[PDB]
Amino acid sequence: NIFVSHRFPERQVDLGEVVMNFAEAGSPDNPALLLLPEQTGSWWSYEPVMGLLAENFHVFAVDIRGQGRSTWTPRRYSLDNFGNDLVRFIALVIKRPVVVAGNSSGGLLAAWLSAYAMPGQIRAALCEDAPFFASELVPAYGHSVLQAAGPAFELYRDFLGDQWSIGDWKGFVEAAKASPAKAMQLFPTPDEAPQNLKEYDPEWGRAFFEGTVALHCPHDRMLSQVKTPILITHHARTIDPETGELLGALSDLQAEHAQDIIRSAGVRVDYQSHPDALHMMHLFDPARYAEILTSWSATLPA
Amino acid sequence: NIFVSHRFPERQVDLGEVVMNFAEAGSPDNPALLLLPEQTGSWWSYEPVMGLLAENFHVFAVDIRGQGRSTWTPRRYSLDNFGNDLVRFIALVIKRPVVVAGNSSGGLLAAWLSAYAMPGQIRAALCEDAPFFASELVPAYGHSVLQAAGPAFELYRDFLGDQWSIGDWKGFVEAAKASPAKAMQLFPTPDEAPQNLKEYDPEWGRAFFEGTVALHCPHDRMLSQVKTPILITHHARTIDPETGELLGALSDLQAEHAQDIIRSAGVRVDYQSHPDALHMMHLFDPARYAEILTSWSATLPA
Ligand SMILES: C[C@@H](O)CCCC(=O)CCC/C=C/c1cc(O)cc(O)c1C(=O)O
Ligand SMILES: C[C@@H](O)CCCC(=O)CCC/C=C\c1cc(O)cc(O)c1C(=O)O
């Protein structure tokens, strides 16, 4: 009960297990657009850009399970459960085919739906800076989660704890600043826990760090099972020259393989590299993100 | 393409990732009934009893993913993925509230649905000798899969292999007889691979033995989340005095706790002990099973 006000009305739908919170904008005569936030991001990660997209889409921004006003589900955090929630959401609330756009963790889920959603649910998928492979424990190519974003997710577990059962925010901030992981500086460490983190279940991080979230969803297989056109945006990424860490969502090599996997599935795939963009372009450069999304959606078949 | 003819015509439906095969009997004027086979059993596990149930029910017998003519999905075998398939099947095919009756592993999925199905999909669930706890790697109570049926699933994996990739049936029968597990005698060892097993993906067994099939579906939490009346039929079970092995689906101690967890959820629960009935009662005593189901179904609301 730590939530705040926002610039769109919020509504909740019972999917069976999770009660998913979401916001709605746009005209139902425009194409439906499902927005999936990143890890630690609530639906209002897209709040600045929703005004822009609502001009041309009927947009649905949702709180994914274990986040925001949506239901926290201990012991049940997996890409399969995340995606099937979204399958039920599309079927119970949207009731039309959708273009799905997801940032990072949400990008993995946009690709998850394009491969494993109910027939006809997904017209196309936008993957904004998705950590393909780089979020797996034992990826088929390139850095593992332990060599990229792992350290921050490990701290969420060790200091915030499942369902905020530890809550040592001060201890987390000090461990983060003192961590030898160069990628740790990509995660914010304010003196007071930010709103999005307070709406976040740290067992997300435990699941990504321990390799359990995508145990049943190997990325090389998921990417080969997609059935709808996919757009891959690749933002800032660098390999630290002292520690070898991946500072970014995925490496150049991992993005190449993901393109080749999709291409071999016979599915249209486009790739845009934005090496100066921030990880969450939809939030910190919503104008640029809206243009990319709106333009790419215009090239999709009706 | 090793399938055999059957009394009831078969039909397939695309659920998105799994193309599910099923057989339909009875009239839509009677209550819908979804039958879930056991592990290694296809829909025609119920073929001998569907004639009786078709006199009072709109019967749907399905091949669960990784079994029969339903899709085999390597690496994605989980209770959540099994259940979400069945959620899709009810939504796409049945389109009406159902009573779910599953045997063994299928009983776990009936309870899974009672907890995690879409709102209104499930009227009640019948769990026929379901291995609650005894099929978990680290159960909350009682024996683990390693002290029950695990040894047989271990042989399925070692000698048959994922997707019948090893296929050393004669090596399996040899290892089954030499096994020190007294519970090994509950599993068939014919000179030729039985038909039901040739339609079965042994990665099923790997998942139950390695503790991955229900890693994200702890039974104690799942049972606490049921939302519909439950009927638990407990068939033959015995504890070996030397090795302590559980010979059967679940122990008396486990069944008692499952009753407690459901009762504390404020949900109706009934418990019928048939300690002389075989595991697959619906197959070897179809009249007895059908009567139990039909009599119990009569006491349901609406
Ligand atoms: C070959 C198959 O029919 C099993 C043999 C039946 C029998 O004679 C006694 C064992 C009862 C429990 C089995 C069981 C146990 C588990 O831990 C998990 C399962 O999925 C089953 C399961 O069968 O689904
Ligand atoms: C931390 C945030 O402010 C972004 C700053 C740039 C950065 O940290 C590297 C890019 C990958 C970032 C996160 C990430 C990593 C994963 O392995 C999985 C994820 O779901 C995310 C995720 O959901 O964001």
Author numbering:
A (entry chain B), B (entry chain A): 25 to 326
What does the primary publication say about this deposited structure?
Zearalenone (ZEN) is a mycoestrogenic polyketide produced by Fusarium graminearum and other phytopathogenic members of the genus Fusarium. ZenA cleaves zearalenone [ZEN, (S,E)-14,16-dihydroxy-3-methyl-3,4,5,6,9,10-hexahydro-1H-benzo[c]oxacyclotetradecine-1,7(8H)-dione] to hydrolyzed zearalenone [HZEN, (S,E)-2,4-dihydroxy-6-(10-hydroxy-6-oxoundec-1-en-1-yl)benzoic acid], which decarboxylates spontaneously to decarboxylated hydrolyzed zearalenone [DHZEN, (S,E)-1-(3,5-dihydroxyphenyl)-10-hydroxyundec-1-en-6-one]. Furthermore, we report site-directed mutagenesis as well as structural analysis of the dimeric ZenARe of R. erythropolis and the more thermostable, tetrameric ZenAScfl of Streptomyces coelicoflavus with and without bound ligands. The X-ray crystal structures not only revealed canonical features of α/β hydrolases with a cap domain including a Ser-His-Asp catalytic triad but also unusual features including an uncommon oxyanion hole motif and a peripheral, short antiparallel β-sheet involved in tetramer interactions.
As HZEN was found bound at the active site of ZenAScfl H286Y after cocrystallization with ZEN, cocrystallization of wild-type, active ZenARe with ZEN was also attempted. The RMSD compared with the structure without ligand was 0.147 Å (over 251 Cα), and compared with the structure with bound ZLAEN, it was 0.131 Å (over 276 Cα). The structure showed again that the position of the resorcylic acid moiety was well-defined. The lactone ester bond was cleaved, and the aliphatic hydroxy ketone moiety appeared flexible. Residues interacting with the bound ligand were positioned as in the closed conformation of ZenARe with bound ZLAEN. The carboxylate atom O12 was at a distance of 3.1 and 3.1 Å from the N of oxyanion hole residue I and the amide N of oxyanion hole residue II, respectively. The nucleophilic serine Ser-112 appeared in the same orientation as in the structure with ZLAEN bound, with its OG at a distance of 2.7 Å from C12 of the carboxylic acid group. Nonpolar interactions with HZEN were again formed by the residues from the cap domain, with a π–π stacking interaction mediated by Phe-177. Additionally, the catalytic His-303 showed involvement in a weak electrostatic interaction with C12 of the carboxylic acid group of HZEN at 5.1 Å distance.
